Amino acid sequence: IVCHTTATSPISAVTCPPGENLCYRKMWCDVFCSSRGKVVELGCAATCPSKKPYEEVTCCSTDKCNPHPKQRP
Amino acid sequence: IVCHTTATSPISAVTCPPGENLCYRKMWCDVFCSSRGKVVELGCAATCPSKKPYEEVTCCSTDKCNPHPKQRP
Amino acid sequence: IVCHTTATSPISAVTCPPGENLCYRKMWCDVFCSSRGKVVELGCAATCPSKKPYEEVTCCSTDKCNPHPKQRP
Amino acid sequence: IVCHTTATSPISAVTCPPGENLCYRKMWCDVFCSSRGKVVELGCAATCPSKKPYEEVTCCSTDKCNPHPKQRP
Amino acid sequence: IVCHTTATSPISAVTCPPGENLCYRKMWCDVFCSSRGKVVELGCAATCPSKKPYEEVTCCSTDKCNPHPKQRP
Amino acid sequence: QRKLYKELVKNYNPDVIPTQRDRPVTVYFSLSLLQIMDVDEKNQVVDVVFWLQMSWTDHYLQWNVSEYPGVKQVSVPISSLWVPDLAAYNAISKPEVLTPQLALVNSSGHVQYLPSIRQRFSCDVSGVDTESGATCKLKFGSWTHHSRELDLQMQEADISGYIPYSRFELVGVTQKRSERFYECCKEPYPDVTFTVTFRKKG
Amino acid sequence: QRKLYKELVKNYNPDVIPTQRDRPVTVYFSLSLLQIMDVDEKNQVVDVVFWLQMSWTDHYLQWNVSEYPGVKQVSVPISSLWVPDLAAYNAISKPEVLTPQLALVNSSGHVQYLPSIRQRFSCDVSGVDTESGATCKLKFGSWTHHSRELDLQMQEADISGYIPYSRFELVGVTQKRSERFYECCKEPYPDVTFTVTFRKKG
Amino acid sequence: QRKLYKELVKNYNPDVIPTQRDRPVTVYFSLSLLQIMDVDEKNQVVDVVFWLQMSWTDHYLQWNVSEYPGVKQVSVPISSLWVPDLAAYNAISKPEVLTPQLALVNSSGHVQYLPSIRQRFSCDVSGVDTESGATCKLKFGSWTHHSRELDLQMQEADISGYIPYSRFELVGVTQKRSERFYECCKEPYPDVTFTVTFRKKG
Amino acid sequence: QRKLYKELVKNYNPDVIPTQRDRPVTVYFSLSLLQIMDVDEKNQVVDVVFWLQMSWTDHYLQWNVSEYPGVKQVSVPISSLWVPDLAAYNAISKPEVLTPQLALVNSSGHVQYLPSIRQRFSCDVSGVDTESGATCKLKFGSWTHHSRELDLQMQEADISGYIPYSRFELVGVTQKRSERFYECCKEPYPDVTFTVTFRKKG
Amino acid sequence: QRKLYKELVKNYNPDVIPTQRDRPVTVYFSLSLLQIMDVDEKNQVVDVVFWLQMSWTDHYLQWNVSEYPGVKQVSVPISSLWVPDLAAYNAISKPEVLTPQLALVNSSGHVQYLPSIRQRFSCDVSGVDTESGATCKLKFGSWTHHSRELDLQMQEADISGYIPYSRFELVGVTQKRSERFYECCKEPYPDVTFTVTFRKKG
Ligand SMILES: *[C@@H]1O[C@H](CO)[C@@H](O[C@@H]2O[C@H](CO)[C@@H](O)[C@H](O)[C@H]2NC(C)=O)[C@H](O)[C@H]1NC(C)=O
Ligand SMILES: *[C@@H]1O[C@H](CO)[C@@H](O)[C@H](O)[C@H]1NC(C)=O
Ligand SMILES: *[C@@H]1O[C@H](CO)[C@@H](O)[C@H](O)[C@H]1NC(C)=O
Ligand SMILES: *[C@@H]1O[C@H](CO)[C@@H](O)[C@H](O)[C@H]1NC(C)=O
Ligand SMILES: *[C@@H]1O[C@H](CO)[C@@H](O)[C@H](O)[C@H]1NC(C)=O
Ligand SMILES: *[C@@H]1O[C@H](CO)[C@@H](O)[C@H](O)[C@H]1NC(C)=O
Numbered sequence A, B, C, D, E: 001i002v003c004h005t006t007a008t009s010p011i012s013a014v015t016c017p018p019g020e021n022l023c024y025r026k027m028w029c030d031v032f033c034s035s036r037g038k039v040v041e042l043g044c045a046a047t048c049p050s051k052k053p054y055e056e057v058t059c060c061s062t063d064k065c066n067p068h069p070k071q072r073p
Numbered sequence F, G, H, I, J: 001q002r003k004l005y006k007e008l009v010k011n012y013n014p015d016v017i018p019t020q021r022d023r024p025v026t027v028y029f030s031l032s033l034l035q036i037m038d039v040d041e042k043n044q045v046v047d048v049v050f051w052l053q054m055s056w057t058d059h060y061l062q063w064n065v066s067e068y069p070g071v072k073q074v075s076v077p078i079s080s081l082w083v084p085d086l087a088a089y090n091a092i093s094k095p096e097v098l099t100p101q102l103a104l105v106n107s108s109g110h111v112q113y114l115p116s117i118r119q120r121f122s123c124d125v126s127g128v129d130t131e132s133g134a135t136c137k138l139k140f141g142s143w144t145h146h147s148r149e150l151d152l153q154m155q156e157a158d159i160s161g162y163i164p165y166s167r168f169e170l171v172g173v174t175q176k177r178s179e180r181f182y183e184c185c186k187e188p189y190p191d192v193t194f195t196v197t198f199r200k201k202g
């Protein structure tokens, strides 16, 4: 399972490690969230990460299904 | 009964709703009241609005009788 | 009796009213008294005005005898 | 006895008054003493003035023997 | 034994005095240590100076073996 | 469109009062007290905020409504054009302007400037706790011009616009213009004294 | 290269609002309250810090993406280009800007300026200890422009960047736009009122 | 017309003292104490406000009454022309000027400047509660010129402009001029010491 | 001899970040905390002083060691050349720079700036009396630039500059760099968070 | 006759330190402590006032005594000519200059600059009540120059001038020059440390 990760710069497509078969995207909303936009996070996880009150999670199985809001799946 | 309202922008002529047959004009006097002029308000009311110490009310029945101080009845 | 008065602007020569036959000049000394100079006052009075501690009075009978310190009697 | 005095401006040579036959020079050291130099004083005295801790006195009998540090005896 | 000393300016090579046969270099790290660099010290001592927690000592016997970090032994 | 700006400040020097041979520049004063920040009974002084209405007519500034396509008025920074050298005589601290340094102008030449200001003036506030209340006089006026160069005409101030929840309550406001002749200059010196009385609520 | 700068400010005068007849300059407001510094129950005033979002479109500023090799956006100092004359109507102290005076710009002409500000506004803080909490209204708006010259439209209000460990806790934040007509000027006068309610923690 | 301004500051450099050799620039000093803000018995210092009278004659500045149609005097900003480098020797805080930075000028060349100032000076205020009262000496004088370059002559010692309701009452005011030679410069050094004694009312 | 200056700032515009397509200006950060002025447990804020190490390479600024007779490096005022728009995100007061506004430059183009700064940041200081101590995070970073325009790389901390006799004792200092991607701009936003923990001595 | 000014600053750039290469600009330091404003035992800091003697020789500035009719020395504003970038290393607040920004100059080229300054430095004042007294070290020195570019030589340690009625009494004053090499720059960094010990009178 190939995914998109924000751990590297620029955001590259790393093969979601063993055990983890889900690509995800979690977005926060900090101070700059009014101008720069919601914080973007992309990674891997066996179990889709739980959503926090203000957070916004999104998971999937397709390859490169968790791209940057300014890219293409 | 057709009236002039300041609820819309620009000030348009709305048909004074049911029950209300009086067009009015209330003018306050705030900080800018020395340069910009007295605050202007135009609306509808069954019973002519009561005048407050500093306020200035004016009612009528004719259509479009409550125009902006810079317009024509 | 013609006098000089500071009641009008600019300082003109008014005919000291009835009963009053004395032209005078009273000078105070305020804040600006250090730069602009002592306050100047010119008028009419039957009885020459009394001098106050800081004040400075001066009376006379001649016509236009109470001119501005920057003029001629 | 002719002396140099700092009582007049510019420093002139006054004839040291009666009873006083000694010309002197006392120099202090104030705030400006670091840039402008030590304060200079020139005058007359029957009895040579006493030296103060920080002060520096100097007396003599010759005429014009107490000149300014920037002049000639 | 010839050494390098920071006691003189510029840093010259003085013959490490009698009894002392070791050239050394002690370096501290102050405020400017982030831009200007670690403080540099060069001198002589019979017994190699003890190292302090933050300090950094270095001794030797060769002539001119304790040069400035920007020079040659 | 807006070549006006480049022209308006072409042969214009803001250090020169726009007088026109015997026509002294007449400025209209007006103070709209906003709120009384604080009072120092110890040193006798009042901290106050207030909008300050100022308007005059600059004969230099003016344009042909035609030559300029629909240009009614423009917002120019007070530094680009001349402005009255008014000074708070009894003030004891540099005036802190809160609002932007802008001023409107009529195609005719009417300049308007309403700056928000906070400033402390010397005043007796000893009787501020008494029901009678203490009173302060804020004397304003040109600092280098007189009646022949610059006439200062007022126009009743506005008590309204004052913080309804202020710890202090206004009992009266008196804005009055007045002149005075000094041992010099045949021309008198105009000045507007904004008097205010206030007590401590509750 | 970056000849853009020299060109962008060639025939540009920052004192002129970029309006295109019938197309008033529309500015998008937005306040992101950071923290409530302090409250003075004595003089009724609140010291607050807050990021203030401002964005508009300057028709003058814009370049051909081609004529300029890979020039997406540039950081220009607010003094080089025009900027809304927004003013804190109820403020009682000059605004202390903490962040750099820079604003970004789209090759299209979209200007964005978000300065960090600390400032004190007049407000009733008497009920700040009550569980109900006290409320403050921070009214903003043009100072020399109206709807026809400059339209002030708001957007998403923010409470996200508020300091958690603050001695005060936000119970509610209301950002609402509103217009107001005056005895003149057929066009209204917009303004955005950022309302905030807060109580004392513990 | 007012072409005068453009000419007055044509070949004029305000950094140059207008001396004509064998004619040192003579400046007339004068202090009009307005009010005594506060006194710090702890650190020995007094906060005071005062009008400062300063007048001299700039040989550079002067115009033919004829060549200029009815131009008596003009208000020029102190930055455009030269001004005495007076310094409050015993001062312990930068001088906060309250009034506008403008000065008047005679067609002859007589320059007059009156800046309202607030400033704190080092002074013994220990005996301010005693009926005898404490005394402060405000020594002023050129910081980089002497008698041959700039002569400092005093004027009137107006006290009348003092605040009545002030918590302090003036018992005496002494303004005296004095020179002092140093180990250099044949020429002496002029300075005006404004002495003031005051006690605490009641 | 020093014609360099006239040339260095000939075709140079400090408002332009000196980048060479395909390569972003990399700036090296470094904070040397000097002393902790004070802490306000009431409003949660810390007053601190510190040296700020900043260094980058301006491709515009650079000269031929030969064409210029022995010109190693020169001290130029930060206003003459470009400088990173770093901002203290969590700061709550304009930064008061204590040291001179000068920076050194390599003949190669290496610019270095070390300004002394005093500033207050929002921070929880409630646990400053506990032996565990309170901690503050001083987050810094570009204000209008991202990774592709300006990369912010740190160069380790320097606690070796703290002030001994300070009422507070540093228990730990952590300087770490970090990026953050937003709902926009493919490139991230690098920021350096200087964390500091301290307790009250004795 | 004062064409000198126009010439002196003709081909002169104040950002360039005046050296004929090989020979470094030698500046003579000297501090004349005026008074100790206050001491904060809480945050360890001292508020102090003091004249600061500075003198050097600018090879650029100099004129032929003949070509200029009786022009001994002139008062030029520190901004027109170069000046040592001295910085108060242990200072914790921007230096507030009280005296005018003017410096004198010899026809030979000797520049004399002495500004009055008030500033707070970090220092241990815990033992200020003890008869032994507390001590403060005011370390000064060029901020961007070393021995080869700018040599800092001290000269006079004037203890005279300290306020007699100050709540504090000076027990000793030590002004000493010293160098120090760092891990770079073969040349050392000269600095003058003005040490002062004082106790509380009574
Ligand atoms: C934008 O810049 C280009 C130059 O890169 C301008 O010139 C030509 O514009 C046409 C548009 O029809 C393009 O097809 C050409 O490729 C451009 N250059 C040439 C001659 O090849 C253009 O006019 C500018 N504005 C536009 C229309 O985008
Ligand atoms: C005003 O401008 C119009 C058009 O340019 C012109 O016809 C008219 O004569 C002008 N009048 C004035 C005020 O000069
Ligand atoms: C300009 O404004 C002034 C003040 O409001 C007014 O008296 C005058 O008639 C106006 N003239 C115009 C329409 O330009
Ligand atoms: C560019 O301008 C457009 C306006 O059409 C808008 O999306 C925004 O202002 C800018 N977006 C970018 C490219 O950051
Ligand atoms: C003053 O005025 C004239 C101009 O009319 C000028 O040329 C000259 O300097 C003076 N002339 C006389 C004699 O008034
Ligand atoms: C450096 O400058 C010299 C002139 O002294 C010139 O001859 C040489 O070509 C230049 N080389 C470099 C470093 O580009």
Ligand SMILES: *[C@@H]1O[C@H](CO)[C@@H](O)[C@H](O)[C@H]1NC(C)=O
Pocket (backbone or CB within 6 Å): I106, I107, I108, I110
């Ligand atoms: C100057 O030397 C080089 C020039 O290439 C530069 O990398 C460095 O940062 C500068 N500082 C040093 C090493 O002195």
